[PDB]
CSV table of C-alpha atoms and ligand atoms in Angstrom, one decimal:
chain,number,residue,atom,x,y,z
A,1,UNK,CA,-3.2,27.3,-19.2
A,2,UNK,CA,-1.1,24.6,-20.6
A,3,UNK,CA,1.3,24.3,-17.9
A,4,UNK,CA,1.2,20.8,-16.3
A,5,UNK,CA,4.1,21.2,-13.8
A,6,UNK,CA,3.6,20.7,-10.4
A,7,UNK,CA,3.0,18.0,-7.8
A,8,UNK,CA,-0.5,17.4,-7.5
A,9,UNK,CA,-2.5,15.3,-5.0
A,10,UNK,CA,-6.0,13.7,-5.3
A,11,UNK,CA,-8.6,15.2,-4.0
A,12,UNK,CA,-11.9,13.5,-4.8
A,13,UNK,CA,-12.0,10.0,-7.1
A,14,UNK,CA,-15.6,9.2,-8.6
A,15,UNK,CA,-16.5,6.3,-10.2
A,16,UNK,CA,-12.7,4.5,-10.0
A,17,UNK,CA,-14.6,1.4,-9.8
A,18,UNK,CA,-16.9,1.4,-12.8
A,19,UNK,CA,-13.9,2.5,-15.1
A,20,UNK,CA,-11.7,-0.5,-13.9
A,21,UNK,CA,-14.3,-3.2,-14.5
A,22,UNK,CA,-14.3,-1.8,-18.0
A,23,UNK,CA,-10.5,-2.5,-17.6
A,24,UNK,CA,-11.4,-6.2,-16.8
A,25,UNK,CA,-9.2,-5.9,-13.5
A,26,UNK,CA,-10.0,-8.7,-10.9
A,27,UNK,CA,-11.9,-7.8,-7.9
A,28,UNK,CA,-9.7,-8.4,-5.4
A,29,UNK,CA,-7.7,-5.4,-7.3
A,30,UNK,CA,-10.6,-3.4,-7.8
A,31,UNK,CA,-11.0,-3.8,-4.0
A,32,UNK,CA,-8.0,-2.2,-3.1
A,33,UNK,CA,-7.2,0.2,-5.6
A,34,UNK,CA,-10.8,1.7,-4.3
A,35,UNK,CA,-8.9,2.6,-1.1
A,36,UNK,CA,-5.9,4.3,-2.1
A,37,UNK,CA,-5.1,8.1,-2.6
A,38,UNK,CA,-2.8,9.4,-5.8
A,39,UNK,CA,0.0,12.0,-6.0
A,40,UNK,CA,1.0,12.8,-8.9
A,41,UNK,CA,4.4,14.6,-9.9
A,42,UNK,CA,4.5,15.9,-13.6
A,43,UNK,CA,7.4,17.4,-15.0
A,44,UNK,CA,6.7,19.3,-18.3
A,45,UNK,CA,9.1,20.5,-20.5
A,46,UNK,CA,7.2,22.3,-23.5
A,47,UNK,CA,5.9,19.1,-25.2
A,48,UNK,CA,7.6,16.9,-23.3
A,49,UNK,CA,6.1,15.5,-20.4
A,50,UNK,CA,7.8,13.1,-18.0
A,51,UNK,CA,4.7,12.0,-15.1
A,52,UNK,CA,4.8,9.4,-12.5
A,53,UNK,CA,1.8,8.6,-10.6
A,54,UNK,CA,2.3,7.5,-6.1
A,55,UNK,CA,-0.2,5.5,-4.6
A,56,UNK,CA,-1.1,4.9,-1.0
A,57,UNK,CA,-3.4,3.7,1.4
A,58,UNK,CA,-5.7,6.3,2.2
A,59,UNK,CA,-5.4,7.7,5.7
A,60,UNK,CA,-8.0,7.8,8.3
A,61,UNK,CA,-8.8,11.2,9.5
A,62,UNK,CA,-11.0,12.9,12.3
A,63,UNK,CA,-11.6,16.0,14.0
A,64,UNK,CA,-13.8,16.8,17.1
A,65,UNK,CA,-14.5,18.7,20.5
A,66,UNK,CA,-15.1,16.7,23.4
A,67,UNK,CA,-19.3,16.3,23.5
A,68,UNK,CA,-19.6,18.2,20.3
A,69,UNK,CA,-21.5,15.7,18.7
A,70,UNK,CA,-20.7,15.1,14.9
A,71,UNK,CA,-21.6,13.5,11.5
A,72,UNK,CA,-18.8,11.1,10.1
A,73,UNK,CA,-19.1,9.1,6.9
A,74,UNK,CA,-16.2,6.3,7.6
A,75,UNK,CA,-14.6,6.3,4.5
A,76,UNK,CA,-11.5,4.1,3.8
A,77,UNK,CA,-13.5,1.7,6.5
A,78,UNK,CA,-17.0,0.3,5.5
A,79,UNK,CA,-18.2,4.1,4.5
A,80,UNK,CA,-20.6,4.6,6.5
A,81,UNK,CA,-22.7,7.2,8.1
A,82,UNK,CA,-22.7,7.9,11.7
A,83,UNK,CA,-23.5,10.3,14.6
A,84,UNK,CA,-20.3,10.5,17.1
A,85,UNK,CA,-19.5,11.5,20.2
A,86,UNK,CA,-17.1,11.9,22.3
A,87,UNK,CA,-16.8,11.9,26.2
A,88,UNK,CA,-14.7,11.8,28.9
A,89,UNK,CA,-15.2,9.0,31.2
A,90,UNK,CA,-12.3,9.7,33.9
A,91,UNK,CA,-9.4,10.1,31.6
A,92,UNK,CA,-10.5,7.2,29.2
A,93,UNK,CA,-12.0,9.1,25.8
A,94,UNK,CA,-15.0,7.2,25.0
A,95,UNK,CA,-16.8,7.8,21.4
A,96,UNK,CA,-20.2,6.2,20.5
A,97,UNK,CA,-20.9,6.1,16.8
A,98,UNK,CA,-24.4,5.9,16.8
A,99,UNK,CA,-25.9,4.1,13.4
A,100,UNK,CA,-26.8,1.0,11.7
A,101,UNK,CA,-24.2,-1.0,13.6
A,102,UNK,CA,-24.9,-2.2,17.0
A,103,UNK,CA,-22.2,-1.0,20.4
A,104,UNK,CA,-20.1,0.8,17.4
A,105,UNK,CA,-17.2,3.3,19.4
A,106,UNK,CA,-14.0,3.6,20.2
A,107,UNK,CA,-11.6,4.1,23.5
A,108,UNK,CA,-8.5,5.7,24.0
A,109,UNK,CA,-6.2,6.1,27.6
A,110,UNK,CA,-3.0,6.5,27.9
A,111,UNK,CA,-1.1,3.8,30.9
A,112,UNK,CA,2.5,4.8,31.6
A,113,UNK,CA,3.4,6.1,28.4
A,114,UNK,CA,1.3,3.8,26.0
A,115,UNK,CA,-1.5,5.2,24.4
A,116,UNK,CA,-4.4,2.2,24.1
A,117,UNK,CA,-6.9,2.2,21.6
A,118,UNK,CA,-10.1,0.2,21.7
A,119,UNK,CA,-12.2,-0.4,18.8
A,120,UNK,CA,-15.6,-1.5,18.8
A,121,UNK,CA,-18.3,-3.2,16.6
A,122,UNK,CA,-21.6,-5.5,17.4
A,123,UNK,CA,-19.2,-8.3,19.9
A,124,UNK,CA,-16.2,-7.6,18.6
A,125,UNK,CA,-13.1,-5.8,20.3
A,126,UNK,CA,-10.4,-4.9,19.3
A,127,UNK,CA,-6.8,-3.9,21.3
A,128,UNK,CA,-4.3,-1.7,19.7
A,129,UNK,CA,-1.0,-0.4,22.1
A,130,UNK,CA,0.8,2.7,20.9
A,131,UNK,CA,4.5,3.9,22.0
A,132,UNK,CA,5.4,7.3,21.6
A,133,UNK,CA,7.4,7.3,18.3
B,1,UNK,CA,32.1,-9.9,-2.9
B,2,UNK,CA,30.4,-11.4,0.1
B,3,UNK,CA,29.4,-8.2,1.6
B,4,UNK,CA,25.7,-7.4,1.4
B,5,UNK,CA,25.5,-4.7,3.9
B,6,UNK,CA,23.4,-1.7,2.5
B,7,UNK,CA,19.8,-0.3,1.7
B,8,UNK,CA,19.0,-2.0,-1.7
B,9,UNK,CA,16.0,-0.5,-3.3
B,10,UNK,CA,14.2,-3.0,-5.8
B,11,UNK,CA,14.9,-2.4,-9.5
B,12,UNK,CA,12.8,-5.3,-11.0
B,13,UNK,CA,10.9,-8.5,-9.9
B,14,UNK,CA,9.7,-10.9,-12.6
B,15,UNK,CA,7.6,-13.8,-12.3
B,16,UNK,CA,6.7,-12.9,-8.5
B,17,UNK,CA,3.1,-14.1,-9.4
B,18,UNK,CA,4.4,-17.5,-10.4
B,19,UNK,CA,6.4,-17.9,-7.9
B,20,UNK,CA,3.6,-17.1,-5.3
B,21,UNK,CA,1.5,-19.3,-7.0
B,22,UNK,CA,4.2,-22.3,-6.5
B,23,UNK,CA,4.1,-21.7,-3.1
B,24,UNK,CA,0.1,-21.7,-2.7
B,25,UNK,CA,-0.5,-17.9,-2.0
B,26,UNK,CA,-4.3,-17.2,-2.1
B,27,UNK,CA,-5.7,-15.0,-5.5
B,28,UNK,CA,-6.0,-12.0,-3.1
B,29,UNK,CA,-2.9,-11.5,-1.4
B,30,UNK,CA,-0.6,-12.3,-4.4
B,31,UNK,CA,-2.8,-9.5,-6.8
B,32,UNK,CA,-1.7,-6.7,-3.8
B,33,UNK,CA,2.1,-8.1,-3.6
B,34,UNK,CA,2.5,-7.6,-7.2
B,35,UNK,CA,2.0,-4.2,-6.9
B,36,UNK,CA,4.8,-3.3,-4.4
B,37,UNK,CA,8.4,-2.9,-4.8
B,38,UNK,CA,10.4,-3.7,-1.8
B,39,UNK,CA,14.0,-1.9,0.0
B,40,UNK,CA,16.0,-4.3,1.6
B,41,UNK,CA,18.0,-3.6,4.4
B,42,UNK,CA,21.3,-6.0,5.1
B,43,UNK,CA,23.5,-5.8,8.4
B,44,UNK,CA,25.7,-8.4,7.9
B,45,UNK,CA,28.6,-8.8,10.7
B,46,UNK,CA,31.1,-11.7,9.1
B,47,UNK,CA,28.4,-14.6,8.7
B,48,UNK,CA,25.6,-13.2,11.1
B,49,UNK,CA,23.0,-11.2,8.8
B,50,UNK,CA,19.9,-8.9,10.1
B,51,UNK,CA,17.8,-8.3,7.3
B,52,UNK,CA,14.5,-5.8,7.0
B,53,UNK,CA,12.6,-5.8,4.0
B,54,UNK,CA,10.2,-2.5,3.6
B,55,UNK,CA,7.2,-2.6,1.2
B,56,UNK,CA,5.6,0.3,-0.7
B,57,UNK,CA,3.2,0.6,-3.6
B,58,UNK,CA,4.9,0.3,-7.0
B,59,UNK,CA,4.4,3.4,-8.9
B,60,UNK,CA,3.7,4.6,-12.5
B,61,UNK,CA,5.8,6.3,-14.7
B,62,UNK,CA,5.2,7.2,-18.1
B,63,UNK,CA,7.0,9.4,-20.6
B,64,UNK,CA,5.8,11.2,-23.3
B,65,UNK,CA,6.0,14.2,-26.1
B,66,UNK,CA,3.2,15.8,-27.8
B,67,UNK,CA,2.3,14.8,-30.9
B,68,UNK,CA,4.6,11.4,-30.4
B,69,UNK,CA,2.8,8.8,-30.9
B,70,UNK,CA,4.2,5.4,-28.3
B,71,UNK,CA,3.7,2.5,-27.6
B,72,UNK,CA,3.0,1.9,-24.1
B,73,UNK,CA,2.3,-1.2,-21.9
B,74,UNK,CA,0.1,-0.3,-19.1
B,75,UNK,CA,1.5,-2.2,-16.0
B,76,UNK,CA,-0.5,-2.4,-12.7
B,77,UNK,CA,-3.3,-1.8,-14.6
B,78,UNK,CA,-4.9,-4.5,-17.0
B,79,UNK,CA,-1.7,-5.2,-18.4
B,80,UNK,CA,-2.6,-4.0,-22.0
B,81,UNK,CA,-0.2,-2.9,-25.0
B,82,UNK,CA,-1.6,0.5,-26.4
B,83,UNK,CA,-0.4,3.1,-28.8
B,84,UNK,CA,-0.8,6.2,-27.1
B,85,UNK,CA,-1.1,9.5,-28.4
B,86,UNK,CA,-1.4,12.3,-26.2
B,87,UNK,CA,-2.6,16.2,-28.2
B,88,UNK,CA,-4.0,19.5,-27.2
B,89,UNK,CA,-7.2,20.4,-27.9
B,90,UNK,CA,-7.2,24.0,-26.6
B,91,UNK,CA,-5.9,24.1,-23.2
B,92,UNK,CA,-6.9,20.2,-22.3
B,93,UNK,CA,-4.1,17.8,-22.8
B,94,UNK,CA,-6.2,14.5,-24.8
B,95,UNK,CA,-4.7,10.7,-24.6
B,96,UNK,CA,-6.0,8.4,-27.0
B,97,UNK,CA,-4.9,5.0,-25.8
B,98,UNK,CA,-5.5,2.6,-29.3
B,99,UNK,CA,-5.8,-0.9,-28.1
B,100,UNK,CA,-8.5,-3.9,-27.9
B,101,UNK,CA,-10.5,-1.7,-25.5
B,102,UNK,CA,-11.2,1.4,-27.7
B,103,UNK,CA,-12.8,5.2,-26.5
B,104,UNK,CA,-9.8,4.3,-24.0
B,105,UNK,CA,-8.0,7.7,-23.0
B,106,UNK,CA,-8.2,9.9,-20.9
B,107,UNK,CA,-8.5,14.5,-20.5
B,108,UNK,CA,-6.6,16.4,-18.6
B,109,UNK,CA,-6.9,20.5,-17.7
B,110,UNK,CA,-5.9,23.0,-15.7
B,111,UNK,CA,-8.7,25.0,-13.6
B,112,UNK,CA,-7.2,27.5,-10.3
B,113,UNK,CA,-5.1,25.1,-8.5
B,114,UNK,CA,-6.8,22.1,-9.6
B,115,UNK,CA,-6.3,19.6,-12.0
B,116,UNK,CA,-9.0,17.5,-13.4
B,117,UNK,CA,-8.6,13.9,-15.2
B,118,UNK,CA,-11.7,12.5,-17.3
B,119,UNK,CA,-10.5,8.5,-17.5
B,120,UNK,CA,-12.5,6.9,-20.0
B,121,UNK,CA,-12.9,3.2,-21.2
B,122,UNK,CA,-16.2,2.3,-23.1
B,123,UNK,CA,-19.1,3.8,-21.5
B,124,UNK,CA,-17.5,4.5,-18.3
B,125,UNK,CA,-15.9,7.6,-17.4
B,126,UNK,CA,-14.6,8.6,-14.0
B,127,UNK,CA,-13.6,11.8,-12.6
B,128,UNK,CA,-10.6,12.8,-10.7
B,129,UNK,CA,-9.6,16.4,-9.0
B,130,UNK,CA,-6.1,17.1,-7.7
B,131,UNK,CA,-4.7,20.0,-5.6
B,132,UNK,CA,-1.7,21.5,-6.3
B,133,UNK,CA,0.9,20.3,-3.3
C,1,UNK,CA,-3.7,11.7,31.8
C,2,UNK,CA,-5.6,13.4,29.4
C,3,UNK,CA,-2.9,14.6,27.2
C,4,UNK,CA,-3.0,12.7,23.9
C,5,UNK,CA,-0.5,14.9,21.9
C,6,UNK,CA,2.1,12.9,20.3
C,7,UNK,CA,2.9,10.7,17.4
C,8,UNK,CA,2.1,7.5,18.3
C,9,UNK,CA,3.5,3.7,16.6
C,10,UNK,CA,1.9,0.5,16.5
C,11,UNK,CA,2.9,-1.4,19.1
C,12,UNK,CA,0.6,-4.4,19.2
C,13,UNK,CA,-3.1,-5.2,17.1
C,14,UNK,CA,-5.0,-8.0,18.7
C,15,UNK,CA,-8.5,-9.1,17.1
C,16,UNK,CA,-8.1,-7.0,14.3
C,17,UNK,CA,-9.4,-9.4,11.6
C,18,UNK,CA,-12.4,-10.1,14.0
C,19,UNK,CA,-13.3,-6.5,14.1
C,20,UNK,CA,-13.3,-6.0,10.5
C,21,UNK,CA,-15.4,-8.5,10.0
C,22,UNK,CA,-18.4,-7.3,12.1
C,23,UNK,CA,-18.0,-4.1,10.1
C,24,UNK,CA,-18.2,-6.1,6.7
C,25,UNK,CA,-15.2,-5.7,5.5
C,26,UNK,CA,-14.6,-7.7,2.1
C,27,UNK,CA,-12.3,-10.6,2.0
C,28,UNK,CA,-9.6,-9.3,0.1
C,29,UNK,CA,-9.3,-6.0,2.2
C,30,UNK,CA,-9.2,-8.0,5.4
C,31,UNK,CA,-6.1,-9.9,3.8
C,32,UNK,CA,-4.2,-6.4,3.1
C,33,UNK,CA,-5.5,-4.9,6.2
C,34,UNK,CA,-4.0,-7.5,8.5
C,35,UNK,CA,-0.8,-6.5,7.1
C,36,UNK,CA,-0.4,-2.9,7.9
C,37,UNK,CA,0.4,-1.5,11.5
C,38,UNK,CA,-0.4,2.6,12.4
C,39,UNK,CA,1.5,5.4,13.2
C,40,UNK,CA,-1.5,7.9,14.3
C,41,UNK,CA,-0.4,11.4,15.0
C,42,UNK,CA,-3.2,13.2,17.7
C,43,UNK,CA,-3.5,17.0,17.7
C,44,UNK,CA,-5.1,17.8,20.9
C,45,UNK,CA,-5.5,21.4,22.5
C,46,UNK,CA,-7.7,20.8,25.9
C,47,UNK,CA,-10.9,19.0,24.5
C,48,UNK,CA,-9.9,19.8,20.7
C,49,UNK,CA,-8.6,16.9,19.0
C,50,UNK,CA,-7.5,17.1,15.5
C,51,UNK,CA,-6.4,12.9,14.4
C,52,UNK,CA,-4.8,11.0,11.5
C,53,UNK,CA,-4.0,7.7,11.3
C,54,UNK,CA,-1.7,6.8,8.8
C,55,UNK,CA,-1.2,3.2,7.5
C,56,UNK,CA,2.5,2.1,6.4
C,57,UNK,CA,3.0,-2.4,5.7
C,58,UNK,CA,5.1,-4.2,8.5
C,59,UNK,CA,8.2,-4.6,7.3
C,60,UNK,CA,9.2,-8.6,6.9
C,61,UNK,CA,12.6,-9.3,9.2
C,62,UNK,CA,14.7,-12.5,8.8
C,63,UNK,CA,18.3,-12.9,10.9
C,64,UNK,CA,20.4,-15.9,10.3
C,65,UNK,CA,23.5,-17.3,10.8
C,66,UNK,CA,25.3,-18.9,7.6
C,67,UNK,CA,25.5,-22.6,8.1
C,68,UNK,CA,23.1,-23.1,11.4
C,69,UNK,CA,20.2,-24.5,10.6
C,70,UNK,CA,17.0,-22.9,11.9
C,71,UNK,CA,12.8,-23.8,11.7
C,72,UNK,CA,10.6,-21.3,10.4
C,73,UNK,CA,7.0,-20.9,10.0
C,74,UNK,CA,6.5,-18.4,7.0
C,75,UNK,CA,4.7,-15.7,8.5
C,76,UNK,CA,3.8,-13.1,5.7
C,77,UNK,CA,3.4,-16.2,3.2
C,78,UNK,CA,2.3,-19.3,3.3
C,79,UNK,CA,2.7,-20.5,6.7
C,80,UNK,CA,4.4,-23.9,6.5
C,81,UNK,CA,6.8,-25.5,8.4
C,82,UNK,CA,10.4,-25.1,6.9
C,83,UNK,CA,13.9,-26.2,8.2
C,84,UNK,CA,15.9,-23.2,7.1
C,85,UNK,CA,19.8,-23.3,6.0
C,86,UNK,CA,22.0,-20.6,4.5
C,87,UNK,CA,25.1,-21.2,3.4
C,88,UNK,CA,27.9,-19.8,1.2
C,89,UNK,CA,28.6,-21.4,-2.2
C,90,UNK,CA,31.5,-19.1,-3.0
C,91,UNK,CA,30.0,-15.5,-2.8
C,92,UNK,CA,26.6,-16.7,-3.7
C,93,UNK,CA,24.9,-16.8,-0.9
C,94,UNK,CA,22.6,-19.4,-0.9
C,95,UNK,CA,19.1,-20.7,1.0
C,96,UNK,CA,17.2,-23.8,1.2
C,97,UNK,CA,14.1,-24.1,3.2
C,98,UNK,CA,13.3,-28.1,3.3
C,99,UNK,CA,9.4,-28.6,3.6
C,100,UNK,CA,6.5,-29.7,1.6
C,101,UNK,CA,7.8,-27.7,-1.4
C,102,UNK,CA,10.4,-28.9,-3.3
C,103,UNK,CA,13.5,-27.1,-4.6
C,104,UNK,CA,12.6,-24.3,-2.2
C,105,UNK,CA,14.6,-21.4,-1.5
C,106,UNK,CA,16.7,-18.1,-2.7
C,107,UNK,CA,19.7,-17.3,-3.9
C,108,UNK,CA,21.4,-14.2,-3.4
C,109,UNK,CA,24.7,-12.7,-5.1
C,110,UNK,CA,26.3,-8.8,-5.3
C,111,UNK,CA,27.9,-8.4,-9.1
C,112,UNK,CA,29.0,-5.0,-9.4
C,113,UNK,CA,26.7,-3.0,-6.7
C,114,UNK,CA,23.6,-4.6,-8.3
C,115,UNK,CA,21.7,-7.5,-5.7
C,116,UNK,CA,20.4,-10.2,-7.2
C,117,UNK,CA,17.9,-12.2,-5.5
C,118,UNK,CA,16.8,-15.7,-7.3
C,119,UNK,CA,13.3,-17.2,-5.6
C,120,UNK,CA,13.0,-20.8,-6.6
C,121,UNK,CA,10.0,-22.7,-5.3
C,122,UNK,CA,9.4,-26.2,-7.4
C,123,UNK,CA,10.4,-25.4,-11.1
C,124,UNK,CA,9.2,-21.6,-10.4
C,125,UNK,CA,11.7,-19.2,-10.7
C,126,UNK,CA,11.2,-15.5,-9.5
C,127,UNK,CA,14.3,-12.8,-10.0
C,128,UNK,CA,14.5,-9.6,-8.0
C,129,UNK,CA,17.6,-6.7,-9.0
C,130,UNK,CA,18.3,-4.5,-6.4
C,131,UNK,CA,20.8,-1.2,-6.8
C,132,UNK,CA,22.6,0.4,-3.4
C,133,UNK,CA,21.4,3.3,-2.3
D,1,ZFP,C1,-2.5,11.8,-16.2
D,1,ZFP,C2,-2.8,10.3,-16.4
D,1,ZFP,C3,-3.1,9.7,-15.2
D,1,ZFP,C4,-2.9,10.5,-13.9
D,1,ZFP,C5,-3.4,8.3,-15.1
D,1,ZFP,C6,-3.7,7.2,-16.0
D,1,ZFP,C7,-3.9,5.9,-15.3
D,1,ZFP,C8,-3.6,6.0,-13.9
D,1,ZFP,C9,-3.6,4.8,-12.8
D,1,ZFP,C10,-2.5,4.6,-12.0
D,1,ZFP,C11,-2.5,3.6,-11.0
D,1,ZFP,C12,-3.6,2.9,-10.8
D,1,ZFP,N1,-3.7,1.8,-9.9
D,1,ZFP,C13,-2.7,1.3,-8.9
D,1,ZFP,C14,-3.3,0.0,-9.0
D,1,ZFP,C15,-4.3,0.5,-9.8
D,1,ZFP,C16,-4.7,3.1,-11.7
D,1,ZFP,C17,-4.7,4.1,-12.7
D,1,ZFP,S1,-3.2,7.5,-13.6
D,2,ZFP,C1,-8.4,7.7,17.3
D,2,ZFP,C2,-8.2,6.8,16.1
D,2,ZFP,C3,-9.2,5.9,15.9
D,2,ZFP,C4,-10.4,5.8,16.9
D,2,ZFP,C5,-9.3,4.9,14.8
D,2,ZFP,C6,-10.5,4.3,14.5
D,2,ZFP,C7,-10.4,3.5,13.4
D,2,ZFP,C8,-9.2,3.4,12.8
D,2,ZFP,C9,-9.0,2.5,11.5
D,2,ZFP,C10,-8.3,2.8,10.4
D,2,ZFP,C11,-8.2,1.9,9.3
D,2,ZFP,C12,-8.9,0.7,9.4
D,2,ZFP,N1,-8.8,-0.3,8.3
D,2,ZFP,C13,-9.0,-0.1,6.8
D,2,ZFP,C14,-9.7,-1.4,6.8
D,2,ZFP,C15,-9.3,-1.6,8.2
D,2,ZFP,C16,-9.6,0.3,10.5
D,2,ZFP,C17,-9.7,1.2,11.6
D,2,ZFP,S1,-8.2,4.4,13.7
């Protein structure tokens, strides 16, 4: 068909990088545009076509059962592969990413009515606090 | 007038590199502000302001008819002036972008709910799929 | 509790650059990545968790009175010491931060229901239109 109308969002991006250096864009630029996600609204009138392209930063996504262990390639992070799960411990969720980086896992509780998130990597921690929004 | 109260959505910003640069803003940081645009919002109560400035990634628009040639300078990108034509060729929409870099362009079609994008620049090529939101 | 459901916001981020860098995160990501904060929205029915985190930049607040002086130490920029003043030069409002920089500050004016937004640093000028919305 030669209809273009619609609102279309990105679904897969291969080789974004390789096409900007032939661009001659810095790598600092490169870097980041490698992270983002595009939606792209095009309004098509015959043989006119008016198009404007959204960018934004890529969101993190996951989705498990409690000790179902799972594959995850961390994407939008430092894309890696790694085999997760997730257990209770008490009423702290506790997940081990098991891979080439060393005491890799997060940890999530709720205090009050904060949700806490701990994120883990080789002897490095780090504290995130969530209200309910 | 000398009240500023209201949400004021950016409608240009020139030389926000420079200025950066005057103000010692490292390489990295000022190549990802230049590609935001910026709503400000102003509660002003006689001389007490609260201001909140929002950030968001810029955009690109671009306009075109079939078979009109244009000339087209391709911001948040490499920063290039082209002459753009965009033609059918059967059912895939084909963008020659005429410039310094040359087999610059890109293809665009229409398969289910998909759309695909070949973007092209030398010997690199890199492949985009979209979903029909 | 082990109820996670809800749409949780940022709150607080502590360590976040170290963490990044155990995972290898390139410089220039770790620059943008220090300026975003999280809203992550968890799905969770019994121990079936759907999650997305979804990453959004910190918006930049400033408050001032016209014509009392105040320090500030330029957070999302270049971190200097300043001695901020803001005062009214008929409906131009106008903003000098004294410091290392010279002839550093903004000026900001409403003609019509356009904002204008001058940023001077040294002989550097950067100018920002803004319309109501
Ligand atoms: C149909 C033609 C399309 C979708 C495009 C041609 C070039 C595009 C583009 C838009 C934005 C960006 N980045 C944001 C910073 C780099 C790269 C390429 S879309
Ligand atoms: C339940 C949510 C969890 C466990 C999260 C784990 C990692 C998250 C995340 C998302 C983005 C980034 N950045 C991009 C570079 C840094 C780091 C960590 S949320």
């Amino acid at each position: 068909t030669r209809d273009f109308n619609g609102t279309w969002e990105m679904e897969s991006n291969e080789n974004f990088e390789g096409y900007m250096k032939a661009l001659d864009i810095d790598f600092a630029t490169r870097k980041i545009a490698v992270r983002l996600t595009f939606t792209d609204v095009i309004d098509q009138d015959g043989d006119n076509f008016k198009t404007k392209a959204t960018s934004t930063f890529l969101n993190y996504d996951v989705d498990f059962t409690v000790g179902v262990e799972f594959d995850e390639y961390t994407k939008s992070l430092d894309n890696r592969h790694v085999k997760a799960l997730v257990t209770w411990e008490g009423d702290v969720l506790v997940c081990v990413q098991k891979g080439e980086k060393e005491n890799r896992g997060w940890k999530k509780w709720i205090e009050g009515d904060k949700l806490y998130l701990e994120l883990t990597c080789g002897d490095q921690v780090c504290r995130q606090v969530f209200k309910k929004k």
